[PDB]
Design a protein around this nucleic acid. Sequence first.
DNA 1: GAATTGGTGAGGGTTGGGAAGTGGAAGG
DNA 2: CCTTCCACTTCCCAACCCTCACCA
Lengths: 261, 258, 259, 1140
Amino acid sequence: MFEARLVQGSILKKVLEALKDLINEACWDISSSGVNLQSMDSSHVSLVQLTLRSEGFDTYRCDRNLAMGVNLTSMSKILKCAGNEDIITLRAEDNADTLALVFEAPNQEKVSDYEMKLMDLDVEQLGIPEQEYSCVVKMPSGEFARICRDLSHIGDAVVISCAKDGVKFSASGELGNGNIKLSQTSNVDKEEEAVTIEMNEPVQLTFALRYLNFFTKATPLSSTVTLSMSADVPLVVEYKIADMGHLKYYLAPKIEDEEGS
Amino acid sequence: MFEARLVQGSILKKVLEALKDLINEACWDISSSGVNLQSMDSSHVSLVQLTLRSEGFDTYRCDRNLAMGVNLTSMSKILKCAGNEDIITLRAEDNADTLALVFEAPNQEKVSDYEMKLMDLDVEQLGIPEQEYSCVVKMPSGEFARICRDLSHIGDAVVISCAKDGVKFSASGELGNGNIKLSQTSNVDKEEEAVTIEMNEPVQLTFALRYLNFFTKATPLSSTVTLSMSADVPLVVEYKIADMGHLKYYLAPKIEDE
Amino acid sequence: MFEARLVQGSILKKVLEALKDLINEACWDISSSGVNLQSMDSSHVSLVQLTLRSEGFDTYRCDRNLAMGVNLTSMSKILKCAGNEDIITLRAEDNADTLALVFEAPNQEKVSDYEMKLMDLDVEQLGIPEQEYSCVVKMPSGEFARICRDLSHIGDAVVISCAKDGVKFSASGELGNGNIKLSQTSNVDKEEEAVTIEMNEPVQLTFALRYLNFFTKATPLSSTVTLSMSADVPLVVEYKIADMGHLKYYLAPKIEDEE
Amino acid sequence: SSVSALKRLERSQWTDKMDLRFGFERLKEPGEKTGWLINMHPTEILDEDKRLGSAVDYYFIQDDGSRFKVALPYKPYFYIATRKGCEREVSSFLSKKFQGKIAKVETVPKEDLDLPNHLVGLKRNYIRLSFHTVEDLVKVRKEISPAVKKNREQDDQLDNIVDMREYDVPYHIRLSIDLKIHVAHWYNVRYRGNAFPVEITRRDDLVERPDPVVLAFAIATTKLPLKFPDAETDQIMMISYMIDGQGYLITNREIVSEDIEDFEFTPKPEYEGPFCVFNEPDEAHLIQRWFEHVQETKPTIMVTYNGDFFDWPFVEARAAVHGLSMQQEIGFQKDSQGEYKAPQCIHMDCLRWVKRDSYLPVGSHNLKAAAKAKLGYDPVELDPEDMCRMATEQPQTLATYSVSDAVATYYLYMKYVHPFIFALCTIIPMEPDEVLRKGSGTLCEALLMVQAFHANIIFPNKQEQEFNKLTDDGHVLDSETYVGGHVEALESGVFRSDIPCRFRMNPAAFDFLLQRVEKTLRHALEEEEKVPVEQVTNFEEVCDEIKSKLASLKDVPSRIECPLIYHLDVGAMYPNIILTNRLQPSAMVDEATCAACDFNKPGANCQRKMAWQWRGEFMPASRSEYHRIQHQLESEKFPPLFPEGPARAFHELSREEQAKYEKRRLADYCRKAYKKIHITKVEERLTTICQRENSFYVDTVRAFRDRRYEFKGLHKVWKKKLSAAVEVGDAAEVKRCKNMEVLYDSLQLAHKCILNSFYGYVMRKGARWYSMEMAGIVCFTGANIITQARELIEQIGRPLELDTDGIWCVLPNSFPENFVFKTTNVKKPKVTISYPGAMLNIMVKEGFTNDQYQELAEPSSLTYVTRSENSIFFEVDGPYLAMILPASKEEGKKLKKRYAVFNEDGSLAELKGFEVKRRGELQLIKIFQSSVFEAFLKGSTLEEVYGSVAKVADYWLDVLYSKAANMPDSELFELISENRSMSRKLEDYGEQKSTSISTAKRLAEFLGDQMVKDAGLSCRYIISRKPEGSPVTERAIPLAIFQAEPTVRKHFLRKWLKSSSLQDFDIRAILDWDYYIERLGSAIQKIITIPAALQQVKNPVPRVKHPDWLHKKLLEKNDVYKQKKISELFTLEGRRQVTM
DNA sequence: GAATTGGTGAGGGTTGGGAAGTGGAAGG
DNA sequence: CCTTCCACTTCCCAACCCTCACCA
Ligand SMILES: Nc1ncnc2c1ncn2[C@H]1CC[C@@H](COP(=O)(O)OP(=O)(O)OP(=O)(O)O)O1
Ligand code: SF4
Ligand SMILES: [Mg+2]
């Protein structure tokens, strides 16, 4: 068996609601060390990684490692049935035809249960460079979300530049130009509102906002997001899920062709 | 002449939208006992009864019977214009082919006054008989509304089952089955918050969930809802309207193909 | 050079959110006295007028009078990027083709800085007529919005009837007919609910609800709406903005020649 | 009864008087005469017992102009079938039950192909019944039909009757099928007195045709201004007509202001058109004089354009107003179907031919258009409102117009209709009225009944429609169908032989062709040409030039070349597929019948199994839910047929009412319980075709194909002889030759029409020989063939358009093209072959060729020879100069069925589906499209081609943006208006919203129900600005109000524009310019600008923007910051699949 | 008594679900 | 008193259903 119980179903709800848009089908790798998911969007421009650690569940059992395929929109549908206060339990077995779920209120006034149908998948696996990044910035997630929405109204592509004084987002289009700027918080009112920039050397990169729009749906997970950037390699955005785990999106940049010539 | 006045004027608004979409046009019967109404689904699978009492109105003159045809969309588009706190007056005549509605603001600084045309209907009716329902359920309304909505995502037919100690709703479909269990409790906080199920003998029956998704529009009329069931007999949903009246929906159980 | 700083940055958003349905492309003009915009609506049914006095801004520099042709859907979209608490600042240069918009977060946490392309326009305009009206009506704006929505539900056009003691609205159509009356208040406890009427001579007039149902889009702009009416002359619907300015719609009365 | 019997005697006598008045003197006297059968009718004749007997009257004409009738008595009959051993008992009851009602009953062996095991030779005894009159048949069948009806549902002597056949064949057709009497043949007839029937026999020796007197006529009437005429109010002004090339005119001096002189009208020297004139003081004299001149000349065919609609009802009513019963004077009376017919002459209407066999678009069914298209001259025109003023102000022009309609009617009838219709009459049992009026599936059915009779087959009963049949999975079906002909537009834009075009090719496909070149030619000569390969000397040389050109292509597969534009299509595909496979409507079988056939043996080669695609649509309710809704109707009750009648329970309704109520209930229930009322389902099916079954259908198709090609060849021979006789100038020989030329040209056209008919008939509702499978198998085999031709062409070159039977493609300039062979035999000394043809043809020959054809060689021994056949062959048209295809406005879609193609001479070769042809579409679109197609020919590069094409599309935008400022006011109304039709009555549409319905109601408000009342109203409207934001349908305003009186216009426009203050009532103010400019923008994008963006050229029309999606794609292409993929930046670790 | 088939474009109206904004009451 | 969550209404786009006339 695999069996897990979660202290609050809102976490797994917010996770599925963040995966639902970007990857339509995926497979989960499950082990006593935790749950891992990695998958690539239908255009290979961006890559999703999710890890939930063994310790964050209220109770956990995993007799053997498992892999199983899930049509994520149907899981998000079933998970629309659970209430925000509910406690949720997952059960599965190595016959791997179905995933059983149980949702209940903290008072056991009511019980809900379901059997999601699993599916078959084939997918390609990528590695990760594990470098240090020439710049990292830590940001209030609601501010990055508004930055993405507002600049997406100006145009389809964003330029991100990190420099010693402050990070800059810029975009332009047929309407004109837009610039949004952040700076080092000198006096911290509260850490969740603080922005911090640390760097080796300044960085300039450009990206398609149509994907960032899909990452910022993670904002209701946690109040702060990590951005990591370095020359000529994918941008990283990272959200942390309590003590349980982390969700990361990698986005490949747009690069100047003239050197290719 | 018929004339009546209602201080809890929002009730007529709430009671009308629970019908506006389920039945296109209806024949109301007016009598000294009160407004009474049997009407039938345009597909004739399901049936409505509305029954007010003349005691509940702030004023009620009815010196003769009337029968009047109305298409409920036309009333609904007018009652949209009434504020929920305003006081409603209704006026009709036995030779007239129109109805007058007056909305009176508690401040007395605003008044409004609408006339709508009747329509010329007649309807052939059998008086709906009593049944000694073997199964009866009282529940908070929002729980039943949530059950019917959430099951609607799984599939279009619900198997409802009952027991001496609870009820079960279940649905089966392309995403896989789903269930909800509601056991009876002895501990209760308040009637608005608590369940009471009684059953003479076990029954389970299959009902079209897209119908219950219409019946659930009555939810804001009452903090509780009554349901009753028996084998080979229509399910009845019942809402109580203060002590001013009651509204009931009748639906036939699905014939199983097996 | 021209620049202005607006600490009440919401009002420029709500103005653009009002104008964008009646006019799609317009030319502003700027003066030492402040900002003006007057323009016929796209269908040429009705006239929109707005001005903001220079006394309303936190600071204002205007070295010469100038005019700026702008697309209101574009400026509306750009201004939807500003938060309601944010400071707005506008600036341009007399020979520039572009208007610069700065939005500052009050805490100085953040800056944002946008440009919009101008376009070149010239437009036909005349000195706006004003005179003593036979009727004036003052009302809570939400009431007038509900009246318009209800009468537009029942009917195509509203007829307004006026008396010393109250004002009445009526309509008729395929659903039937409807009558609504507001009487003058007996005494006022809190002002915004108070309905007050000035009345020199009885007037009754008819108007097309499509345009009043656009005009009411300024309801978020102020809690009190005003109507000025007289026989055989345009209805004026007027909203007053903070201290600094005002927004008026001019709409000619419907003729009833067929009788 | 006796009153009806005397009424039948009365009508028989009256008709005999009426045709005697026209000189059809009945033959009553000993002798022999010969003549040409022109007409026939069924009638009773008084016999020697003074009884009525049913008979047929045959009408003959002679070269000297004499005429006669013959009356031939024949007993109508039909067949009944009975259970084993019933025949003597049932026949004795049939006789005693109806004694004196039936003439003869007898036992007849006949063969029915539906009988089990029938190929061995089994056939069964039917009983024939026959009657002294059809009225006794019509009575007795109604005494039998309940018994066979009940036994047909379930399964006295009536219960022993099992089935009844042939009871509804028309009696006269039953006679022409039986006696082999046929129309447009010379006959010798022998009269022997009433002691014997009259004997008729054909002479084949004579082929010349007589010239039966044909009268064509047309009329013109007064009418109220701006409104239709009606017979109570108006009067005829002129009637103009021609007899056998001589014209006559009558004019009414009550109205026409001057006497008319005789004059001559000749559009072109072939149309002689001399007109003689009669002036009459009174309408009653106009009518009387015309009736007199018809009674003088006594025509045998009478013709007018669409006469059943107007010209007969009006002259009938105006005659009856003065008491002249035209039914008595002329004899013409309206039949039950509302069509005028007469005893002595035939009513032929040109428009019932134009609508059926001319292949004209519905754009040009107006007489002046059909004349201009087929006769090659433009006729003369009048505004239909001015005729009433012109009759006063300038009568000569009205006379000229009304004569011109008579000339055009007469010559159009003579050249096209008359040869065709009598040629087709030579091969069908039917009268010339019925052959012209009836639908082609009926003609094909009568022809098949002729052949079935000659084979001694007994016909099936007409198929009867089932209602609400059930799918096996239980859903009630809305519809069943088969998947039709494949289509795909593969490419878009411009192709020309004179521009460089880029090809990429598969060298293994060239190697594959080069390996087989010898086989491709050896087959292409021997099977297609039928020239033996030994008879030709240069065969070994030409193969080397083919192989060396293919090698030179193989060495450089990717290149830039000029294109060759070719059209490659199959000749008579569907008949050839039928003949090749031996498909017959009765030949489809199932395992349940092959279980019975004694020829079902191990290795029996006769079962041919072929694939077709069934399609259904059904409602999602289940079997029990529908059955519950049926039960719910057990308590319902329904109105009577008349307001005072008794209410009907559901079981007392007709089955058509029952099915409609059930469909209404289930359609509402499904809309309540589900979002979606219907589901489509597609299913591959395999069907077994028997290969030994009687070939009468397939052999009929064969015979018509062969005889078509025989007459086509003879027509070529005689047209050469005609050209020689005209060049020599031998007028008597020219006349002889032209007569033979028109005889063969009409015969070949009639055989082409009949050959085309055989496919669709098998799907006609209630056809005798009906089956859906045979139409599916044909459509699917014609989708396979064209698909594989696409696949094979797509490697060599670039296919451009593909429809049901033919491909449009471009091929590289270096391709083989055509080759020549020299023959030792002088009979065919040189032969030419085309390589794209033999290339495709050998591909067809390998896959499709049938190898299971069987034919009965010895009827006494049941030995069948087994044979292969292929009759499908491709042929090549072109090569053409230029080809153009449009592109869709939506992303990635491609417009099927729209293109233009040009001959090498720059004359337009084809132009298909475009709005220039359509009826109703806006005239500005017609002119824009027509001019741009011509403009595409100019220039030498894509840049220059589009630089030319742009200006013609700019001109119209320039005009519209200028509000046509300088264009005359009368021009806009023709430029800006639609003319859309309306096929139904205005009440019949129901509550629908559309622009035509709107503007018909907008006429009803303005001139009353007098104007809407008739079907087929034409609606001319413009779409207007002033009701701002009102949806499009509500802004449609008739053109008529711009012709109406000023004080009516200034009222109705003020009402309709919802603008009481409106001062300006001018189209130039009212016009919604931004609607018409959006229409033109919708057109111009599909042809000139979007295709340009698909061919690597910048937007050629600055004023029109691209669609947003295309602007996004073109903007993303061009920026320097190229998007990398993640797989190119991070290391790929592997690939995995997950499975349980 | 009557009765050819299927497939496509163009223009227009109706129906249903998701996204965004506003108001209340509920919780800390 | 201030912030968050849930409920209800409005706005916008896509897909289906109607007509007629032409390509095979
Ligand atoms: N009026 C009609 N009714 C039914 N099917 C029809 C039809 N018109 C066309 N079809 C269908 C069935 C036939 C098919 C057209 O292909 P073929 O080669 O058989 O006809 P064609 O090109 O006229 O003959 P060719 O000139 O090459 O000798 O379209
Ligand atoms: S197809 Fe062959 S087996 Fe079938 S019925 Fe015909 S002859 Fe017999
Ligand atoms: Mg062909």
